[PDB]
């Protein structure tokens, strides 16, 4: 889901709820997801901290 929504359109997904954000930060981090989107996902949690 995230990979396609990021490649086709210049946006990141699942910004709707906090639990999905915490998990996508946590369990994800494999090569499978693009790092360009992934650092943008991490920065949200960093700002919350």
Kindly list the residues in this chain that would bind its own copies in the complex (CB under 8 A): 8-10, 31, 35, 39
**Neighbouring residues of 6: CB distance < 8 A, sequence distance ≥ 6:** 12, 13, 34, 36, 37
Min CB(17)–its own copies separation in Å: 23
E-strand spans in the chain?
none
- Beta carbon nearer to its own copies, 9 or 19: 9
- Beta carbon nearer to its own copies, 19 or 27: 27
Alpha carbon distance 42, 29 (integer Å): 10
- Beta carbon nearer to its own copies, 3 or 18: 3
């Amino acid at each position: 889901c995230i990979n396609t929504y990021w490649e086709r359109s210049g946006r990141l997904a699942f910004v709707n709820s906090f639990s999905m954000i915490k998990f996508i930060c946590r369990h994800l981090g494999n090569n499978a997801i693009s790092k360009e989107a992934y650092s943008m996902y991490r920065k949200i949690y960093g700002e919350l901290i």
